[PDB]
Paper text:
[name] also serves as a receptor for [name] ([name]), which is the most toxic protein and has paradoxically emerged as a potent reagent for therapeutic and cosmetic applications. SV2 family proteins belong to the major facilitator superfamily (MFS) with 12 predicted transmembrane helices. In addition to the transmembrane domain (TMD) core, a cytosolic N-terminal region and a large fourth luminal domain (LD4) are present.
In addition to the backbone–backbone interaction, the [name] His578 side chain forms a salt bridge with the [name]/A2 Glu1156 side chain. [name] Phe576 contributes to the van der Waals interactions with Ser1142 and Val1144 of [name]/A2. To enhance this interaction, N-glycans attached to LD4A contribute to binding. A N-glycan containing two N-acetylglucosamines (NAG)s and fucose (FUC) attached to Asn573 forms extensive contacts with HCA2. The [name]/A2 Phe953 and the aliphatic portion of the [name]/A2 Arg1064 form the van der Waals contacts with the two NAGs attached to LD4A.
Author numbering:
A (entry chain B): 876 to 1295
B (entry chain A): 480 to 590
Write the structure that this text describes.
């Protein structure tokens, strides 16, 4: 069902479909270290990806349906040079007819053109004054379905965001060549990242789109806040999804000391551009291998690990006394060689029992392989103290709404720009 | 009181850590570059037509103090009570507020 699908291979980009699309790549196209299947394009002329189809699959029909899907990571817009500056990132237009994908300040645009120069555009708008965004500098699964008979639709992370009728458009003749390059961007320090570009010759329904989203999500591997792979030996700031105005902190170091959620969070501002919340607040959480059999640094599902807490540029260990009063075992930061036999091994979870993808959960365990429970928070006398509890396990068993046991790992990223 | 206000028209401070406690002043047209403001109290002090550019504010207590027609660039407000009502018609660019002090959301006077 897929006609074009750019994937990575041995030091090149190939097309998985049985059409063998020729791909021409500029000398300034970059790749990640860890997920080299994600591609980076910067604002220069040499940052070029050129893919050429065959004549047998050129879109030149009257009522042919088609769809596209890809993942995009768009950095934060920092200044007012970025306003009112729609720039094209994916181009498929020849002779003022075709389809194109463009970006503006806080927008992702899908555009269609016929030979009569009719414009139909479908836009996904995300604000950038929000405290915590799901779209700024984070991976977004964008898929667009076009029904030549009814209307055209844009889907963000599997859900329908906008739709506009395209019945009036009569004939689209797209180009033989597809261009991945920033066009018309006045900011010289601007870039995007894309991955998993696919094309289909039918309008996908919500079922197929959700299937594709789940299949391409790599549910077996944890993801950090930006949507990249989670890695051992790397500092991470911690965000609790249930209470996202507070950041993890400690007050003392030892068995007597505890760690809690302190707030409120700060803010990073550029007047009339962005008024987000500071994400580099609190104590970093390094994750260390304990029993990972994989050679890579990637943290996968059910990987028993250790957790180091960075306090005053010194490393400590996240552990509890399993035998204490109550169900909520309070988490504490200990000297790494003075932990003894306290429960420290954490089982990292990416998906649930049924395999449904969810956020990051940490399951504190003892040396007997017994579940103290999911790591969360519990308020003691108006202090939101970090605990490990089996209550969260009970709600998970009862398919209830767990409160406070889901976490995000926030490393320092260049696309956010906060001053640490 | 308003009769005794001192005015300093035009200033250019650059690379100094600069604390004080000033009362009933107006600064107009200042230009500060890479300055540190640690542990200072401001009573009825008003900054006007100023530029702050990689400045740093730490432990600032503000009593009826305003920044009008002021421009802040790559500045940090750490542990300060300079809330959003003390920047009248200002522009912040890539500025950061951290560990804001507790206080009222409106100017209540500190008599
Ligand atoms: C606003 O900041 C961004 C991000 O830069 C980071 O944050 C700053 C506050 C400061 O701490 C920098 O040292 C940080 O790197 C600036 O955008 C980047 O600027 C750097 C040079 O400083 C440049 O190398 C990058 O390419 C820029 N990245 C992007 C995405 O543009 C931005 O320039 C600052 N705003 C203004 C108006 O200058
Ligand atoms: C703060 O101000 C006082 C008097 O204005 C000065 O003596 C002192 O040195 C200042 N603090 C620092 C850290 O220099
Ligand atoms: C301050 O003066 C006027 C506003 O009264 C304005 O034209 C000018 O640009 C301002 N200066 C700065 C640096 O913002």
């Amino acid at each position: 069902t897929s006609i074009l699908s750019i994937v990575y291979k041995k030091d090149d980009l190939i097309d998985l479909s049985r059409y063998g699309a020729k791909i021409n790549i500029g000398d300034r196209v970059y790749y990640d270290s860890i997920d080299k299947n994600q591609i980076k394009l910067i604002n220069l002329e040499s940052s070029t990806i050129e893919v050429i189809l065959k004549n047998a699959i050129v879109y030149n029909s009257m009522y042919e349906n088609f769809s596209t899907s890809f993942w995009i990571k768009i950095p934060k817009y920092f200044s007012k040079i970025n306003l009112n500056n729609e720039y094209t990132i994916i181009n498929c237009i020849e002779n003022n007819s075709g389809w194109k994908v463009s970006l503006n300040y806080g927008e992702i645009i899908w555009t269609l053109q016929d030979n009569k120069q009719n414009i139909q555009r479908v836009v996904f708008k995300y604000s950038q004054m929000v405290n915590i965004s799901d779209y700024i500098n984070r991976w977004i699964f964008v898929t667009i379905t076009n029904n030549r008979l009814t209307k055209s639709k844009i889907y963000i992370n599997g859900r329908l965001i906008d739709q506009k009728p395209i019945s009036n458009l009569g004939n689209i003749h797209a180009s033989n060549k597809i261009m991945f390059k920033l066009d018309g961007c006045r900011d010289p320090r601007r870039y995007i990242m894309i991955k998993y570009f696919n094309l289909f010759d039918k309008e996908l329904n919500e079922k197929e789109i959700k299937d594709l989203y789940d299949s391409q999500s790599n549910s077996g591997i944890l993801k950090d806040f930006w949507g990249n792979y989670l890695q051992y030996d790397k500092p991470y700031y911690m965000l609790n999804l249930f209470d996202p105005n507070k950041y993890v902190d400690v007050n003392n170091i030892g068995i007597r000391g505890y760690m809690y959620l302190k707030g409120p969070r700060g803010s990073v501002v550029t007047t009339n551009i962005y008024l987000n919340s500071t994400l580099y607040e609190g104590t970093k959480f390094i994750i260390k291998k304990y029993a990972s059999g994989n050679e890579d640094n990637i943290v996968r599902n059910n990987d028993r690990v250790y957790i180091n807490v960075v306090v005053k540029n010194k490393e400590y260990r996240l552990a509890t006394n399993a035998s204490q009063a109550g169900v909520e075992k309070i988490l504490s930061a200990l000297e790494i060689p003075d932990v003894g036999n306290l429960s420290q091994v954490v089982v990292m979870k990416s998906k649930d029992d049924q395999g449904i993808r969810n956020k990051c959960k940490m399951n504190l365990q003892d040396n007997n392989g017994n579940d103290i429970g999911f790591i969360g928070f519990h308020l003691y006398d108006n202090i939101a103290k970090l605990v490990a509890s089996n209550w969260y396990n009970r709600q998970v068993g009862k398919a209830s709404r767990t409160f406070g046991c889901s976490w995000e790992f926030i490393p320092v990223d260049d696309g956010w720009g906060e001053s640490s | 009181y308003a009769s005794r206000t001192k005015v300093f028209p035009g200033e250019r401070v650059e690379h100094v850590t600069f604390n004080f406690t000033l009362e009933n002043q107006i600064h107009r047209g200042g230009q500060y570059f890479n300055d540190k403001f640690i542990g200072l109290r401001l009573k009825s002090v008003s900054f006007e037509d100023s530029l702050f550019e990689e400045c740093y504010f730490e432990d600032v207590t503000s009593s009826n103090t305003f920044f009008r027609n002021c421009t802040f660039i790559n500045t940090v407000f750490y542990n300060t009570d300079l809330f959003e009502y003390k920047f009248v018609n200002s522009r912040l660019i890539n500025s950061t507020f951290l560990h804001n002090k507790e206080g009222c959301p409106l100017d209540v006077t500190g008599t």
